[PDB]
Amino acid sequence: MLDRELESSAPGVPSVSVHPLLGSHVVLPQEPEEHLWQGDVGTEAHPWLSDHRVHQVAVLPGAAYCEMALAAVTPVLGDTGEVHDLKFHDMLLLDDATPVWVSAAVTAPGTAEFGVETHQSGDRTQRATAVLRGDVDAERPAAHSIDALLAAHPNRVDGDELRAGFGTVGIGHGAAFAGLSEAYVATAAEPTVVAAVALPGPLRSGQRGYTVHPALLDACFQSVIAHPEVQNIASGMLLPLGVRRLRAYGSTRNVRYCLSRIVKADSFGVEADLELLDADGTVLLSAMGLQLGTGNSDKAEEERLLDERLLTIEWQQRELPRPGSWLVILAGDDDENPRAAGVVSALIGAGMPTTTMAWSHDADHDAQAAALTARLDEQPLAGVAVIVGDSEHDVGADARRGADHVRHLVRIARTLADAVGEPPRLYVVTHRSQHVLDTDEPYLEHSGLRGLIRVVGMEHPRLRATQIDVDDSTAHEALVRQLLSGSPEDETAWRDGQWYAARLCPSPLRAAERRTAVADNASEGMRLVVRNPGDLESMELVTFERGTPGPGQIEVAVKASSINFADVLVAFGRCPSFDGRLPELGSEFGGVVTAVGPGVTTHRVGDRVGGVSANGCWSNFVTCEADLATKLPEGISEHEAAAVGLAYGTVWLGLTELARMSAGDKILIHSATGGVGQAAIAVARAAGAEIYATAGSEKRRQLLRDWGIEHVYDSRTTAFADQIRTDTDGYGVDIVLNSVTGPAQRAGLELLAFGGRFVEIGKRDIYADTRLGLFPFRRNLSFYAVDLALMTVTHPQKIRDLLATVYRLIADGTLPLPEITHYPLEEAATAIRIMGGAQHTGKLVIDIPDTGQSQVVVPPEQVPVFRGDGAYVITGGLGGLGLFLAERMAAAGCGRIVVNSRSAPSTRSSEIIELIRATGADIVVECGDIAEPDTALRLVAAATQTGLPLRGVLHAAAVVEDATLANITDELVEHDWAPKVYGAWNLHQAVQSGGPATSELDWFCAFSSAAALVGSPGQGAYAAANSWLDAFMQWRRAQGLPATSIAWGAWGENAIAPDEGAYAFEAILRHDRVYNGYAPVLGASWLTAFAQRSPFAELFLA
Amino acid sequence: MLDRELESSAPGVPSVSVHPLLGSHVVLPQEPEEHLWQGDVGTEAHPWLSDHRVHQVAVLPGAAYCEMALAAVTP
Amino acid sequence: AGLELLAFGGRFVEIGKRDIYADTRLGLFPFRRNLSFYAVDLALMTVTHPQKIRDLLATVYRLIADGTLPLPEITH
Ligand SMILES: NC(=O)c1ccc[n+]([C@@H]2O[C@H](COP(=O)([O-])OP(=O)(O)OC[C@H]3O[C@@H](n4cnc5c(N)ncnc54)[C@H](OP(=O)(O)O)[C@@H]3O)[C@@H](O)[C@H]2O)c1
Incomplete structure (x- = not known):
């Protein structure tokens, strides 16, 4: 194809x-040499x-603009350049089409401002910038010894x-970005990385006119992470932000290695x-x-991890689907169960041969166990239904009985496991054992049995250990319909004639799962804000900590604030x-001074003032600076100063002030039926200006004609100009007072x-960044940008004197x-719906609720968890978890922590308490x-003694004695159950028994274990002690008291870390969720x- | 050249x-939709x-601007 | 660069x-900081508002003669 090259040197398609x-x-x-590419x-x-x-979501890599810049040098500065x-x-997110404009302009000789940007919907967005230099000297770095390296x-x-590890932080590198073959390193001391990179096959064909392919350059940036010091330290999402110097000394076609240095x-x-290198x-x-830094912060990573790690049980309304001998056994003989009577009659009624066993407590368990094992070997049966005896309200008693109920289920479970033939299906039936419907008050006793059946279903899965929660009315x-249908659910419930099924799932919501409260309107801090803008139904009233003002600030008691058009956009996220x-809702206010911060001479307490602040002025109390408030004249009120101000x-x-409005000169006021518009008409009228x-x-519009103003036009057109x-x-x-946009903004200038x-x-x-054409400025024009809001921050003394003169001018009656x-x-909310609809006229004022009337509020993360003015209690606080939180609580700013444990302080613990008490x-x-x-x-009385009320409890107390079903003794069950459950009821009773000091606590948390939820084989006794405590916490909440339970995983000192749980604990305390399950999940x-x-875990498989 | 096209079905010049x-x-x-050509x-x-x-002295005929205008309509 | x-x-x-x-399209983004652009053409002013130019000359001739400037x- 020489012919082909000599052929080509002849014609020409344009x-x-x-x-x-x-x-x-x-x-x-x-002039000067200004360039412009569009691609x-x-x-x-x-x-x-699309592969990066x-x-x-496909996004443009850094390396893509690296090339764009390198390319742009030679066409601008016809030479070798940096x-x-x-x-x-x-971050440019890509679509099937993403147009981008590169633009390089010469500024100084051998120098050019380079800039990449993207225009969509009218919004220009600068995606990348640099300077180009062609005057730099070619000091080619010395070549290396590839093999020696x-x-x-x-x-x-x-x-x-390495690329699999990238996908865990969220960065995906597809087939095209897989250039990095391997990277060789040494130790954390040696700061270099040898990387064997190569441009993939699909792209070696598409190298075209690239200085360096972005896919390849990005492959070398991947190589920087391979370094041990980078993997150890910045163990998060690393993204490239820029490059100080970039020079190409030749063809990067033949590039096989990259030599990185940290x-x-x-x-x-x-x-x-x-x-x-080649x-x-x-x-x-x-x-x-x-x-290479991190925009995606280390705080947003924690928040995201916490969400994937939490688990809670949820109940679905289900129906019985589709389509042998039986044995209905009881756990209490002296108690006559109508459920056991009615079930034996309904099985015989359906046509199944059902027998009956009366195994009770305080009976020959070895003889009754032999009698059972004989009935199983005598006749082959399909299933075995274990009914549990009912007390038929005291928790203290249901906690003592609960042990005797568990111990009895261990004895029954061991005999069904040791079966010669095929073990039959086990159906454990409990009376209102756990919380399913929100209205329910759980009947304890049986609460602890849900942990054992979960452990028995795992240790001996032949007998499908199923649970059935039942009520009186059903x-x-x-x-029996459920027993004979044979559905595979291992945890189910019955409430009235409806059937409920258990299903595990993660649910770290923050809406109804957030703390709620009721607060006074005259006292106590209440602000108004949208949790997620766009939805006005999301407009919430929230509570805040009303603090002492100062220095050089004031707390004003608001009587009335305004609704500006700013405040509407904010609602919709459009601000x-x-x-x-x-910004936070409500700019200006009209109120009275409550407390003057140290130390200001201007403001005094009880003075009627009007001001601006941000920080949410749609509240009962606003803290503003001294700079931003001014005393109101006798002529205007708090409600009149609220509208007028801005x-x-x-x-x-x-x-x-800016335009210096003279008399007679013609003024244009866009949307003059609004607030600023009416105010405009006022001053333009005072001034004598001819209004348009x-x-x-x-x-x-006919409203403006009725106000005696001729020259009314449509604001939604560019007709007004020529009209x-x-x-x-x-x-x-x-x-021109220009509230309007785009063509209508340009049209005004014209x-x-x-x-x-x-x-x-x-x-x-x-x-x-709408690039306005300067041409009309040929007639000595003057453009004036206004941002009062920003001025409030840059020059607040102007805004003070501005609010002051407008309060004077209106109080005098000048305007x-x-x-x-x-x-x-x-x-x-409705003001925003109206104002948002443009239905309104003039200013809308929001009257703040006077009078000590109550309003339902929502504290989010303003919840005083760790506070100095309150006392704390930590059972099992002299070891393991409980001692770690005691060091963190003191560190978090707590006053008086009463740690406890039956054992005396250990030697390493006594050293940890010496260094905390000194601090x-x-x-x-x-x-x-x-x-x-x-x-x-004794613990409660000790924590109160120093004039501090009790504001929180923690139950880290525990005894873990694990054993297989075959060797779980009745004594071993008492050792695990006693601290977990009897400590909770004592801790509960002490708080009620206590005076006003303990009738003020913010929380009561119990450290359970995820082995109760899952059913870790070998736990059993410790798993049952937790299930009861998880239900007791839900009972404590039902009555009205605060209660929390966190089922913890595997702690370090794949697995839960020490600092990972501290932040997780503080998060869970701030939310109103009763049952939580922090445990590692991944796969x-x-x-x-x-x-x-x-x-039960159907959603985890997916 | 069916060959030349198949081997060139790989290194294409942009x-x-x-x-x-x-x-x-x-x-x-x-805004507004503003176009710009350089030629x-x-x-x-x-x-x-050069024939006109x-x-x-060689000058651009009136007809050249006609074509330029007609060309710029469709885009 | 001067506006920025x-x-x-x-x-x-x-x-x-x-x-x-x-007719240079001047990017409006820097104006977010309450900026103010002023176009000045004394030549045009001499026709549109000659009284303002009369007073502007008169005031500089006074300041310079007084020694103020x-x-x-x-x-x-
Ligand atoms: N710091 C500052 O720069 C500053 C401070 C405050 C106010 N302002 C500006 O002044 C303007 C008006 O504020 P204002 O509250 O005093 O007047 P407003 O009349 O209370 O605000 C609503 C007006 O916005 C117009 N509008 C345009 N698009 C709209 C939409 N999608 N939804 C609803 N209304 C729409 C309506 O015009 P029509 O009459 O044509 O229907 C309506 O009269 C806003 O642009 C605001 O930001 C500037």
């Missing part, structure tokens, strides 16, 4: 060569770009093995320097100063802010003439106040056995084994 | 079709343009 | 006519 990414290049007709970085355009994806200070900003680095990291390695990020070891590209005809953080302010500033106004609604131009004989206006004063109050267009529609704080806070140690009642009273062996055996 | 006069086209990232109308690029000359 | 420089107070006084008559390097 085309031009372009870069794959950058795209079509045009140079702008303007698609879409997934349909460049399929290969974050959280299952790319300086390359920064990436927002590999000798110094023997520790081989497989590429795949500069700095920190928890925040990793700086590194790279060198792409087989000869000669440097082809040097990316020196690559920064009918025996429907109960722009320089801060970035979505509207008249924004207008005063705008028209008289707009409105969207014809009702609201006003005709209605002014081609003169146009003088001032309208006003010579005098030309454009007051832009509308943020949308500025925070979208008349506008349409004020008062609303109750409750119906603040401020006190750790009172009170020995005793929580099983004895006097011990729990464990015990979970995959449990999911396939029973349908 | 190029794009353009108008002879208008040339390279870019739509600016701004050569020189005698080296378009030899035939006013007072012995 | 000024902060909060932000008072950009463009006396230079080249970029205005060129010192005159600059003048080369005849």
